[PDB]
Amino acid sequence: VETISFSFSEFEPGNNDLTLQGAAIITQSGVLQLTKINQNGMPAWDSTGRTLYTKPVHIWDMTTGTVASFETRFSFSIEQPYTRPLPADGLVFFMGPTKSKPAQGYGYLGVFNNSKQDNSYQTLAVEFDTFSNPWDPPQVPHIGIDVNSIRSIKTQPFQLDNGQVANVVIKYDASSKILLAVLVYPSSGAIYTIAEIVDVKQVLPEWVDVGLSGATGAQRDAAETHDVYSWSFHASLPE
Amino acid sequence: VETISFSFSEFEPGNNDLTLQGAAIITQSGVLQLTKINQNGMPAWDSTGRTLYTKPVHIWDMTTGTVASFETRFSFSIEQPYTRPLPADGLVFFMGPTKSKPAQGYGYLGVFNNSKQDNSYQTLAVEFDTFSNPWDPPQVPHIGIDVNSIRSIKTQPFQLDNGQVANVVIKYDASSKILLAVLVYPSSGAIYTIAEIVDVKQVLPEWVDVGLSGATGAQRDAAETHDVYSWSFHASLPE
Ligand SMILES: [Ca+2]
Ligand SMILES: [Ca+2]
Ligand SMILES: [Mn+2]
Numbered sequence A, B: 001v002e003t004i005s006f007s008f009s010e011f012e013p014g015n016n017d018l019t020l021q022g023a024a025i026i027t028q029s030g031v032l033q034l035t036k037i038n039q040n041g042m043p044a045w046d047s048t049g050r051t052l053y054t055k056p057v058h059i060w061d062m063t064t065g066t067v068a069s070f071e072t073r074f075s076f077s078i079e080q081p082y083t084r085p086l087p088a089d090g091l092v093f094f095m096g097p098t099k100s101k102p103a104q105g106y107g108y109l110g111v112f113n114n115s116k117q118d119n120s121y122q123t124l125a126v127e128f129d130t131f132s133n134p135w136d137p138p139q140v141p142h143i144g145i146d147v148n149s150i151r152s153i154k155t156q157p158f159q160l161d162n163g164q165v166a167n168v169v170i171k172y173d174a175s176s177k178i179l180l181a182v183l184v185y186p187s188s189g190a191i192y193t194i195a196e197i198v199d200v201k202q203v204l205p206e207w208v209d210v211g212l213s214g215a216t217g218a219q220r221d222a223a224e225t226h227d228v229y230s231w232s233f234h235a236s237l238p239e
């Protein structure tokens, strides 16, 4: 069995096990700010940032046909400072081709480049979407499972507890092909769940990079914070 | 669309929407004690109790072939007073034939009668097992998905936070056939998940009763509390 795992109780500036991209920044206090926070302490619009675990994950083996099961956990906070314009756009956990570069920002969360379902993306993602784009359900924010597209194969609305820390748990069981996500707000006790069938073997390449990405809006002040406090990951590939 | 739903933010003695069976009683304080609490304030062994919702639920329709999606949530607490003998046995949420009475207690949790996988049980359930019987995984407590058998088709160990309140969320999406269960301990922030594929049409009858059940051990002082503070349920049958 081939296994890989990491756990950051807090983010460490300078730890090479994590690559920062775009506006992404790790504060001295240990917080990962995916989208730029201005001098005045407020989230900047037109911003996109990501972080990738430096080491690639062996998610499945073509020769043997085996597929790994995995789980990732992280705590994050989103603070929407203005009543208008609407806030945007969200953050997301993603898995895809190794050594990828940030894609289009805004509603594409830095992971996609358009709103088409393309197998060439070879990406699987769990989003926490804050702005309703033409391809989105009307309810916002919402959790969404993305398979080779920003257009979720399934979504689940949830209420944002402004500035409060949300605990997220994502798990994929290769035998049942079930990918599930759970979001918990310890502040209010609220619990949300979403799940769907996903055959990673039909989506992702054998080796992938796992990461987090966030993006703020296209017009002035259509922004919000996309801070992450901790991130753990584990994958087990049977032989 | 055929929909049904109920929500007890608390329990009240006398409310006839809930049928109490065996040792289960609703205290003046509004707490549902599935298993007998003696006069000295401790849990009695050799006790089995359950509560059923008075009205049946239309889970699926043979003629049209339509299948209902549902979700249920509840809060419970288990207190294990002694170091020895081991505590036992657990509580569980179940869906099965209407007009049912409590089955065997102990490790069968008042829902099954043996350790066989019999289609005649026509029962689906999510247990929170505190004792490890011969058919169980070695770790207890554990969550488990039961399909016509006390021998779970899938289990998930978890740590008990003694006497603390656990928040449970169980959801079933018929289109994906996914059955998910989540447990959250507000006290510690701990989150546990478990999911599996279940085709209710191959398991349950068209109409079912939904309920909760708890049981204590077969030997003196092999017991624990099985209190439920709240319970909600909702189902929706397409067309
Ligand atoms: Ca969006
Ligand atoms: Ca047991
Ligand atoms: Mn979306």
Ligand SMILES: [Mn+2]
Binding pocket: B127, B129, B136, B137, B142, B144, B150, B152
């Ligand atoms: Mn068990």
